[PDB]
Ligand binder design. Structure first.
Ligand SMILES: N[C@@H](Cc1c[nH]c2ccccc12)C(=O)O
Ligand SMILES: N[C@@H](Cc1c[nH]c2ccccc12)C(=O)O
Ligand SMILES: [Mg+2]
Ligand SMILES: [Mg+2]
Ligand SMILES: [Mg+2]
Ligand SMILES: [Mg+2]
Ligand SMILES: [Mg+2]
Ligand SMILES: [Mg+2]
Ligand SMILES: [Mg+2]
Ligand SMILES: [Mg+2]
Ligand SMILES: [Mg+2]
Ligand SMILES: [Mg+2]
Ligand SMILES: [Mg+2]
Ligand SMILES: [Mg+2]
Ligand SMILES: [Mg+2]
Ligand SMILES: [Mg+2]
Ligand SMILES: [Mg+2]
Ligand SMILES: [Mg+2]
Ligand SMILES: [Mg+2]
Ligand SMILES: [Mg+2]
Ligand SMILES: [Mg+2]
Ligand SMILES: [Mg+2]
Ligand SMILES: [Mg+2]
Ligand SMILES: [Mg+2]
Ligand SMILES: [Mg+2]
Ligand SMILES: [Mg+2]
Ligand SMILES: [Mg+2]
Ligand SMILES: [Mg+2]
Ligand SMILES: [Mg+2]
Ligand SMILES: [Mg+2]
Lengths: 20, 77, 93, 46, 63, 102
RNA sequence: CCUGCUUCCAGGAAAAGCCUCUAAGCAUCAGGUAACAUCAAAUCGUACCCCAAACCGACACAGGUGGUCAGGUAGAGAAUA
RNA sequence: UGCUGGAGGUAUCAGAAGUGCGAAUGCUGACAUAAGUAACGAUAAAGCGGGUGAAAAGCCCGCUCGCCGGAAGACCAAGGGUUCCUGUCCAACGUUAAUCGGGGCAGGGUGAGUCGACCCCUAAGGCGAGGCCGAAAGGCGUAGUCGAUGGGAAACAGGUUAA
RNA sequence: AAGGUGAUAUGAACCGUUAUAACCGGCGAUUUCCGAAUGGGGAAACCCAGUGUGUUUCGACACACUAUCAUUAACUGAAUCCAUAGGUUAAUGAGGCGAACCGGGGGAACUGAAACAUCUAAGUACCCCGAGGAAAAGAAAUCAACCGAGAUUCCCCCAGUAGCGGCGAGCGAACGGGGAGCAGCCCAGAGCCUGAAUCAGUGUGUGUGUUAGUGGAAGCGUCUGGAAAGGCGCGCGAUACAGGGUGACAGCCCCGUACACAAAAAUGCACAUGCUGUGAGCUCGAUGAGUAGGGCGGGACACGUGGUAUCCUGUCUGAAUAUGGGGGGACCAUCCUCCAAGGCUAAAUACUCCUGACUGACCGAUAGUGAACCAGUACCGUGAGGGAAAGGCGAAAAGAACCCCGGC
């Protein structure tokens, strides 16, 4: 199809720092 | 350009070397000067950008010869 | 003269098309596809000589080609010039 | 919000156009590569 | 139709020259475009004829 | 230089119409040929709304390889193969197996 | 109207068109000014969207997009109803 | 060897390797799953009658109702580049249906001495004969020559096209 | 040459069949605009000119020419009178593009050393300039070792040796030997004799290759099958059994193949000459100084300054001149050997954008080129730039007339 464009981000984003 | 109009001397690349022999690019460039030369054979002064040696040649061979060259070779002057 | 007889190959076709053409017939003037490089005056001459009619003044406009069809690639048509010519009075063809 | 592409043909041609490309030894090499590559639009101009 | 006019006089030819355009070619376009001209091949020649016309005359004068 | 040509009588060599003979109705750019009455098919021709509109089945001639037709002798009544040359003024085609010339 | 007027300091493009001045140069000429008459003014753009479903946002995307116009009732109002 | 398939395959003994896949968050394609679940993009709002049609909540016409009104009305520049108008079609595109569309197909439509560009004029800045400078490439700059975001002659009220 | 008017691609209207249909080759003709772009400008394919030409409708438009630099000439010509610089015209040539090979100017870092400076990667990658069909190199101031060799280039040895080396990592010769190919000449000059050798540019001729072409052997019967080229039988050609095609696998159906032939024209290559330019020859001469060498700093030589010869030179210096000078790996003697400070030079060597022919224990559509396909495309990106997917109906379109459901 024409149908062919994927610009998948970076992870997605929000949160996490999980105690250091 | 830093080219001697008599000898064709131009800058040449070599190295520096420290006491530890570290090589660092560098240039030796000639002892240019530009000098009003009397010709008499043309009742005029001509300024050649000339190296010492370029002068010492002119001293020996004598101007007009040197000027045959240049003109022979096409140098503006 | 001013324009060589040869170069009066500027008239390319009548544009008898649409009431635009014909309803603007029934109130002076005729319209035509005409060259591309044609110079209003240059095309008036053509209509004087050939067609042997009178001509008050000529207006020009350029039609731009429609681009169409095709899957991936694409096809375009040619541009061309319109006439709208306006004949003096003893109007015939 | 205002995004990065703010189109303007004057700037386009002046910055990327044929003549601009042509005005510099490297700009010319730009074309040369594109010709050798057999590109259908050397430089997106009118 | 070639050597038929290899020998047809530089000045004389500019006549048929016009006569190809002056008549055939212009009338043909008009007549054609206007949906008349049922024999299209007339457009092919005439054009091709003028080419011949201009091949001589160019090769006769100067070249 | 074509060993087979326009109006010309041949005997089919291979397939379907093995033994049949016929005149070459016409020869094709492909080097295939249409031999009248010979290699027939039944085209279901479609109707066309604006005039010549009815349409119907039609028996029709189907092109076939020149490789598979041989020129017919008549003098012997067999396939013959062709050959070239007089040294007359022209070239001309002669039957192999009796330089018979035609 | 107003590129005005008043006032202030931070002191507010350029060049041409236009007017005038003459040099070389032309002096019956050519040119210059006016009235009337006449001729020329080519070429290219001109559809449509333009605070948006037609532009930048991958979308018929609650976003971004400079200029122009601006009626009644209440109201200080281009607020607000 | 049966079926499928419809044109190539090769014992034997030697010879040579792109010679064997389940894993590498391997690569490409195809197909699952969650699931007929979330969702269908501003809470300005719809009701009915009549047309058309295979079918009308959505199109057409009408009467109500409601919403913006310094806009959600109107004219442009920039940008797009036929999206304009008319016929025709509804598969795909439309977050539903679709007779409707900025969608398909075809035809039509942009008329200038006066609006604007071109044009004359220059700002920033660019280019730059010679020239000065630079290992080469090149750099800077004079005379100039380009560059509008500014200067420069001139048409208004009305009518008409489906456009 | 009997059939043609390129492909998707039918159709229309045509054209041709014994020579002006088409098709192939040689040479011509035309050859818009942009692009080195060259009349000025410019947002490439557009705007605007000066000057010349051009009109039994001599206005405005159309066409031609006008860039810059170099060389040469001519005419002009400042401060300055001479003279120069400057200025106009003219004749020539240059300019831009292009795969690699080649010479030259510049020249990395990752990396290796199990870290890292010296060293390595490496004079590599890359930028730049230039040229040719090849480039470069080349006719000993070379080696040898007291016997001798005799330009340059390439191949195999010598040998991973001798050496170099934070003597680490690594780098790495030469002497001599076997081979490919072999070639030698000018200037540094005047006299006589003079255009005599030769080289290039060019016209002709000839031969030979090239760019279209021509002829080219011989198979039939039958079985299975939609179809024979297959099986079986019996013939035949072969200087032709290379290969492709044809309804399944064809020496004998087709196209070829072996073999033998062909060029009106244009050309590559050889010779032969004509024209231009060029010098040959004998006598007597001449013999490459800001150079060799040295000092300082670097760089090259396998060689890292080391006891370091040798080569190059940025810098400052500076000889001898044949009874002279260079080298023989510090250096000296003797011996031996060569003649620097001007050039030219073919072959053996390198390369393949491209032309022709042939070959493969190379791939067969996720392979093979990114691309078997209208691919550097669609697409993505302001741009440089990145960059796909996608081949197969059948032997032949014989590509499904007509009827029925459905919303023509
Ligand atoms: N939530 C993110 C983690 C994260 C935190 N900060 C970020 C910033 C950018 C991207 C991702 C992240 C994840 O799923 O991995
Ligand atoms: N670590 C904190 C805050 C946080 C959110 N996203 C983050 C991304 C990067 C660093 C910190 C954060 C938290 O998860 O609650
Ligand atoms: Mg117009
Ligand atoms: Mg409008
Ligand atoms: Mg919408
Ligand atoms: Mg939107
Ligand atoms: Mg409000
Ligand atoms: Mg697997
Ligand atoms: Mg495993
Ligand atoms: Mg669920
Ligand atoms: Mg639920
Ligand atoms: Mg829901
Ligand atoms: Mg469209
Ligand atoms: Mg519309
Ligand atoms: Mg739908
Ligand atoms: Mg539409
Ligand atoms: Mg200006
Ligand atoms: Mg310059
Ligand atoms: Mg500058
Ligand atoms: Mg402006
Ligand atoms: Mg130009
Ligand atoms: Mg120019
Ligand atoms: Mg390391
Ligand atoms: Mg001896
Ligand atoms: Mg033949
Ligand atoms: Mg044969
Ligand atoms: Mg000597
Ligand atoms: Mg040499
Ligand atoms: Mg592929
Ligand atoms: Mg497959």
């Amino acid at each position: 199809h024409i149908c062919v464009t994927s610009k998948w981000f970076n992870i997605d984003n929000k949160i996490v720092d999980h105690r250091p | 350009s830093r080219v001697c109009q008599v000898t064709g001397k131009r800058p040449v690349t070599g190295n520096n070397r420290s006491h530890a022999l570290n090589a660092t690019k560098r240039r030796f460039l000639p002892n240019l000067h530009s000098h009003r030369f009397w010709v008499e054979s043309e009742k005029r002064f001509v300024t050649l950008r000339v190296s010492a040696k370029g002068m010492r040649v002119i001293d020996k061979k004598g101007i007009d010869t040197v000027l045959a060259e240049l003109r022979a070779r096409g140098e503006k002057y | 003269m001013i324009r060589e007889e040869r170069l009066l190959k500027v008239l390319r076709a009548p544009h008898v098309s649409e009431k635009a053409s014909t309803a603007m017939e029934k109130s002076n003037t005729i319209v035509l596809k005409v060259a591309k490089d044609a110079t209003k005056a240059e095309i008036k001459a053509a209509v004087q000589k050939l067609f042997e009619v009178e001509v008050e003044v000529v207006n020009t406009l350029v039609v731009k080609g429609k681009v169409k069809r095709h899957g991936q690639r694409i096809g375009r048509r040619s541009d061309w010039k319109k006439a709208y010519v306006t004949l003096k009075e003893g109007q015939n063809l | 919000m205002k995004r990065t592409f703010q189109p303007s043909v004057l700037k386009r041609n002046r910055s990327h156009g044929f003549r601009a490309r042509m005005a510099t030894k490297n700009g010319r090499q730009v074309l040369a590569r594109r010709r050798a590559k057999g590109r259908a639009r050397l430089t997106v101009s009118k | 139709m070639k050597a038929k006019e290899l020998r047809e006089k530089s000045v004389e030819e500019l006549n048929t020259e016009l006569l190809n355009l002056l008549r055939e070619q212009f009338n043909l376009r008009m007549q054609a475009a206007s949906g008349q001209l049922q024999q299209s091949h007339l457009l092919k020649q005439v054009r091709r004829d003028v080419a011949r016309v201009k091949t001589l005359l160019n090769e006769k004068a100067g070249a | 230089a074509a060993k087979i040509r326009r109006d010309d009588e041949v005997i089919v060599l291979t397939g379907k119409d093995k033994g049949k003979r016929g005149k070459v109705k016409n020869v094709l750019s492909s080097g295939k040929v249409i031999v009248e009455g010979i290699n027939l098919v039944k085209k279901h021709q479609k109707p066309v709304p604006a005039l010549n509109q009815p349409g119907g089945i039609v028996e029709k001639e189907a092109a076939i390889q020149v490789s598979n037709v041989a020129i017919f002798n008549a003098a012997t009544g067999k396939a013959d193969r062709v050959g070239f040359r007089f040294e007359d003024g022209k070239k001309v085609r002669f039957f192999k197996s009796n330089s018979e010339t035609i």
